[PDB]
C-alpha cells in the first residue's frame, strides 16, 4: 500500500471475470456464453466463437472469379474458408462435425495429413472401437488391434479397405494410361469419396459439393500400404503434388477475404499468401490444439508466429484455444455453424 | 496381403461423434462426448465417476456404518461419502469461483484444500472485481499502470489495498481473542472466521463456514494473505497458526469417512500413506482430477491418477479418471451433468 | 519478392545461428558452450548459465546487517540466492546436485514442497529404486512399492523413517513444553538436518552452514502422517507458520540484492518484494521446468508474470528453460557454481 | 504404525545423481544421468539404446543375410542395421541442423525423412545465416522489418529472395531434362539434385546425395519450395514431382532391411503397416523418439512409441526408448556418447 503504486483505471469497456451461476439451473447455451468471462481458455473458446461468427457473417455477404487460373467448379464467395485437421481427428468422432460442415458447404478448401482420408472411408467399411491410452502393444498385437490414441482399430478394417480399394486403384491406372487422366491426391481423394458412395463420409459430401482435398503426403498412411502393396499386381499409378499445388495456391490468392479454422496442429510456414493481391494474409484465423510453442515446432506456434510470414495479417485478431479438439471443436460449431445452418 | 501379414483379431464401444444435422440439442451433444475419444471419451467418464460418487453419497447409513461414521468429533454430519474438493488458487481468480461457490452452498461437498492464493482471491473478489487482459501482456506495462497478472485475468493493486483495508480489524481481534480468550489458530480456523466476516453469498468460504465445511491450506501465509499477516505484525506480534490441528483435523476426517471421492482440479494430490490408516474403507473409492500437467517431469501436479494407487490413496478396485484438459472449460460442464442435475437431492 | 518487403539490416550484435562441429571431435565443454546459438531451449540454456553467472559474480562482490530483524545468524551477501525446488527433485538424482550447492553454501535460502525434505532424509536410511512411469498401481501395491514418476521407494523405507523419527519428535515436544521451545517448519528442519548427521543429506548441510528451509506445507507429505501418529502417543506438538514468514521476509527485505533459481515450479504471488526499500523485486531469475501457461497455473507462469507483481525487477533479463530439470540442472550447474567453486 | 497399515516389499538400480565434489568431469556426469530419474533416466536408456543400434550396424553380413540384404535395387550397399533419421522442419532452422549433417557426412544413418520446410532451410543457410530472437517477438514489428519467425530463430525475407535466385535456373534445368531427356522426377530426386548443386559441405543435402543417403519428404510442397516451385510454372509450366515412385523406394528399403532402427527427433512415426510386409524381420529392432508432444490428444506427435508396437513398426520384442525433451538440448548430448565415440569405424 504505501509501496504499491496506484492503479491507472481500466478502460470503461473492461471485462470482469464472472462464471455461470448453477443456482440458474442448467441452461446449456447460457452455460457456453459464460466460458467468455470466466477466464483462462475458457476466454479464449468464447474469443474463438467471435472469430469463427465473424467469418460465417463475411462469408455469406453477396457478392471476376478468375476460372480459369483456379480450375475450379467452385464459385468464390465472399469468405474462402480453409479447414484443417489431423488424421487423428478423422479417427474421432470429430469426424462427425468435421462431415457435418462440408455436407452442408460450409467450408470451401479442406487440408489434412497422412491418414486423415483412408480413415473416413475405412470407417464406411467397419467401426472404430473406444479403448485407452495405457493398452500395450503386446497384448493388442497379440489380439490384432492397432491404437489411435484411446482408440482401437481391428487389423481387418485394414483387410476390408484394401479389398474395397483395389478394383478403383485398377480403374484409376487404366483412366490414366487410356484417357489422358494426370492423377494428383485431391483428384484421387475426390474419386475415393465419390466411390465411398456413403453420407456419413466426409470426403463424399466433399466430392458431392466440390470442396478440394488436399494431402501431398497421402502416402505416408494405410493409403500408401495399398498403393503400394497394389503396383506389385498392377504397376504404373503416378500421382502429381506440383498440380494440387497449383490448384490450392490459386484458391489462396484469388480469394476475396481468407478464414482458417486448424485443428489438432499448426500452419504451414511459406509466403504464399503475400501473393494474394485483393487481400493479402487471412482475416480471420482459430486454431484448437494443446500443442506447445517452446521446441519451436509448426504444431506449437502461436498465430502470431503466422503474421511474419504473411499468412494471418497483421490486423486479424486471430484466436489460439489450447485444448483437445475433441472436447472444444463440437462445442465451437454447436455456437456458430450450426446456428446459422438456415443461411447455409 | 494385408491379410496375409497382419493377425486377424479375436461390450466394445462404437466411435460416434454427435450429428449436427440433429440440430443443436446440448444434452445430446454432451452425451455423445463419450463416444468422440481422446478427452472427450475421458470426459464421459468423469460424468459416470462423479455421479457414481454422488449416488453413494446420497444412499442411507446403515446402522454399523452410522456408528462407524459418527466417530470424528465434528460440527458437520457425516454422509455415505465424504467428497475431497481440491483446487488450484488460479481457478479461484477465474470464473469457476462461481462454480466452486455453487457446490459448497448446497452442501455437495465435505471438505475443500486449496493452495496459496486461494483463500483471498475468493474474498477479494466480494470488495473489487477481477477483469479480462492476454497471456502476452507485459510486466513493464502492467506495473506502470498497477495491474497484477494471473494468466489472462488482471487484478489491479488497488484490490490488494482495499483487501489490507478490510482485514487489519479482523487480525486485531484475532490476537485479542488469542490472548485474551485462550483462542488456537490455525488456518482452517482463520479461513471460517474470514468468510463469517465477509458476509456475502457470492463468496466461496462464505458458504464453508455457513454448512460447516472445513477449508485447509497449510500453506496459506505464501500468498498476499502472508503480506498482510506480516505487516500486520509489526504493530501487533504473536498471531500463531498451527499447522499441527488442522493436519489432526483434516486426517481425522480422512480416516473415519465411510467411503472418500475426491475431485482435483489444477493439480495433482499430496503423496502420503493416511488413507491406509482409514479402518472402515482404506483408500478413496471415487477420483477425477481435471488438469493439463504433464506426468514426465515426476511433478506432483502432473502424476496419474494411478500413482496414488501405489500409496494406497485410491484403492486398486477404483475407477479414477484424468481429463486432460483446462479445468476453465471442463469443470462447469462437468458439473452440469452431475451435481446440477441432483441439485433438489441436496436441498 | 515482388511481395516480400526488404528486410531491415539486423543489429550489428546480431547473433547466428550455429551447432556444435563433431568433426572437432567431442570436447564437453564446447559442446555446452555451443547451445547458446543452437536455437529453442538450446538457447535458453545459455541465457541461463550467463544468468546464473550474473549472480554469482553479483554475490562475490565485497560488501547495516539488520540482525535485530532477520533473526538470522547466516550475514548477509551482495546477493541473497533463494532456491526453490518440487519434491519430486529431492527423489531424483537432483538430490546430489543441491546437495552440492547447499554443502558449499553457494545459496541462502531454501524453499521447496510437500515430501521435499523427508525424502533427503529417507535416501540416508534406504535407497530410491529406478522404475517407469507405465508400472500399474496394482503391481505395485501387491509388492509394497510406491511409485514417484518413474522412481520406486518401497513401503519400508517410510517405516525406517518412523522409527528414526519417533524419538526425535518425543524431545521437540518435550523441548517445546519444559524449554520454552516455540517450533516452525524451518526450525524443524534444522533439527531433523543436524540428527540425520550424514554428509549426503541436503538438510544436515543446510543447518551446518545456517541456511535456513522454508516449506509451510510440512504436513501435506509423509512427515504429516508421522507427526499425526506420533500425536497419538504423545501428543502437543505446535508449528506456528508466522514466525517462519517473518523469518522468510526479513531475508527477503533486507537483502541487498535477489536472485532466485526455481526447479520444477513457479514463483508464489505476493507483494512482498516491493517492500524490500534498499532493492525491491528480484535482480535475476532462472526457472527450469516443463510446466505451461496456458491454464493459468502458477507452475507454469513465466517470469514476466511476476514482473507485474514487482517480484521481479522490470530491468532485470529473467530465463525460463522448457525443460525436465533432470536432465538440465546438473549441466547449468558445471557451467556456473562448479566453475567458481574456489570462489567459495 | 505405516508397518502396522502398508505391505513389506518382496538388477535394480539405485537413484543417484552426479557429484560435483568430484569436478567437472564430463563424461561422468553425463554417464549419471543414466541414475538420476525422470528424463535423465530416459536419456541413459536412449544412449545405450541407440550404441546397441550403432553395433549392430556395425556387425558383418553373414552369407545369408548378404544375400537377402542385397535385394534392393539401389547405389547404396546394405548394412546389418538400416537407420532411418526423422526430424521436423524447425530442426534445420536450429543448429541442430549442424548434428545432422555430420552424421550424413559420415554415413552414419541410411535415409533422412523429414517434413515440409527440413529440405529448403539447409539450402537457404548455404546462402545466408538465421538469427537467434525471442518467442515472443511481435508479428506486427518483425513484418514492419521484414523478418519471418520460427519459434526464437528469425529468418530475413532476403534470405528466401536470395533462395528463389538460386533456385530458378536449377527448376528451368530441370524441365528441360523432364521434357528432353525422358526424367521422371520425384522428391528424393529433386532433392538430390539440389543438395549436388548447392556443392557445400555444410549442408545436410550435399553430403545426404554424396553419400548416396535418399530424402523422403512427400510434402515437400508445402514449405518455401513450393512457393517457388509454383512461382515457377508460370513461365515455366508442366514439372511433375511423383510421389508414388518415392513410396515404392522407401518401401523398398524398409522391406529388404535386415535390421530396422529409427531416430524420430521432434515428431512422432507414421501410421501404416509396411513393417509387417520385410520377410526377413519385420518392425524395428531398435528406436528413439526426443519430443516434446504429448499423448494425451491422440496426435501422431505424441504418441508413445508403444503406440507403434500395436502398428507392427517397432517390435515387441524392441526397448524402445522416449526422452520428452527439446531436441536441440538432447540430441548433440545423445550424439556426443554414442555416434561420436564410434567415428572411426565409420571412417
Ligand atoms: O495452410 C495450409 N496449406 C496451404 C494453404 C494455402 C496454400 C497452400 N500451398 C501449399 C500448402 C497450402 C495447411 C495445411 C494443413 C494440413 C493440416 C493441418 Br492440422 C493444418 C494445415 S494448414
Ligand atoms: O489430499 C489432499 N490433502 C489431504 C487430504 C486428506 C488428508 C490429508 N492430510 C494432509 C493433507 C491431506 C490434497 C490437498 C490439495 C490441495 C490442492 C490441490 Br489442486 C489438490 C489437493 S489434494
Ligand atoms: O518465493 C517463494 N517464497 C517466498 C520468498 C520470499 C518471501 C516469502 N514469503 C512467503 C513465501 C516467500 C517460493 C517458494 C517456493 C517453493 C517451491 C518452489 Br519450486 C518455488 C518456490 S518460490
Ligand atoms: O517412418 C516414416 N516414413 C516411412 C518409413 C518407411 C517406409 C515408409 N513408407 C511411407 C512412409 C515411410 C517417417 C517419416 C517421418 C517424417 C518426419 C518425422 Br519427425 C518422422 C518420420 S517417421
Not at 142 to 149: D, K
Not at 262 to 272: D, P, R, T
Not at 295 to 314: F, N
Amino acid at each position: 500500500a504505501a509501496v504499491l503504486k496506484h492503479s491507472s483505471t481500466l478502460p470503461p469497456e473492461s471485462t470482469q471475470v464472472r462464471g455461470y451461476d448453477f443456482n440458474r439451473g442448467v441452461n446449456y447455451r447460457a452455460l457456453l456464453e459464460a466460458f467468455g468471462t470466466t477466464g483462462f481458455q475458457a476466454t479464449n473458446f468464447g474469443r474463438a466463437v467471435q472469430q469463427v461468427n465473424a467469418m460465417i457473417e463475411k462469408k455469406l455477404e453477396p457478392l471476376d472469379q478468375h476460372a480459369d487460373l483456379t480450375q475450379s467448379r467452385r464459385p468464390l464467395t465472399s469468405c474462402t474458408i480453409f479447414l484443417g485437421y489431423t488424421s487423428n481427428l478423422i479417427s474421432s468422432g470429430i469426424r462427425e462435425t468435421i462431415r457435418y460442415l462440408v455436407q452442408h458447404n460450409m467450408v470451401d478448401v479442406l487440408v489434412t495429413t497422412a491418414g486423415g482420408v483412408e480413415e473416413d472411408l475405412i470407417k464406411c467399411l467397419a467401426p472404430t472401437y473406444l479403448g485407452e491410452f495405457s493398452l500395450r502393444g503386446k497384448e493388442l498385437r497379440e489380439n490384432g488391434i492397432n491404437r489411435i490414441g484411446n482408440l482401437l482399430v481391428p487389423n481387418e478394417n485394414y483387410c476390408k479397405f484394401e479389398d474395397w480399394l483395389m478394383p478403383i486403384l485398377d480403374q484409376m491406372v487404366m483412366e490414366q494410361n487410356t484417357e489422358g487422366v494426370k492423377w494428383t491426391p485431391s483428384k484421387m481423394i475426390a474419386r475415393l469419396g465419390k466411390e465411398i458412395n456413403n453420407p456419413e463420409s466426409v470426403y463424399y459430401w466433399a466430392q458431392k459439393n466440390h470442396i478440394p482435398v488436399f494431402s501431398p503426403a497421402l502416402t505416408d498412411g494405410s493409403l500408401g500400404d495399398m498403393i503400394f502393396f497394389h503396383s506389385y499386381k498392377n504397376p504404373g499409378l503416378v500421382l502429381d503434388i506440383v498440380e494440387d499445388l497449383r490448384l490450392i495456391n490459386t484458391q489462396a490468392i484469388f480469394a476475396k477475404c481468407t478464414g482458417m479454422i486448424i485443428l489438432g496442429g499448426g500452419v504451414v510456414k511459406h509466403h504464399i499468401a503475400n501473393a494474394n493481391l485483393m487481400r493479402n494474409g487471412a482475416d480471420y484465423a482459430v486454431y484448437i490444439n494443446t500443442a506447445q510453442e517452446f521446441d519451436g515446432s509448426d504444431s506449437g506456434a502461436r498465430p502470431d508466429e503466422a503474421v511474419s510470414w504473411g499468412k494471418i495479417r497483421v490486423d486479424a485478431q486471430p484466436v489460439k484455444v489450447y485444448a483437445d479438439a475433441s472436447l472444444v471443436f463440437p462445442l465451437l460449431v454447436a455456437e456458430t455453424f450450426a446456428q446459422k445452418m438456415d443461411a447455409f
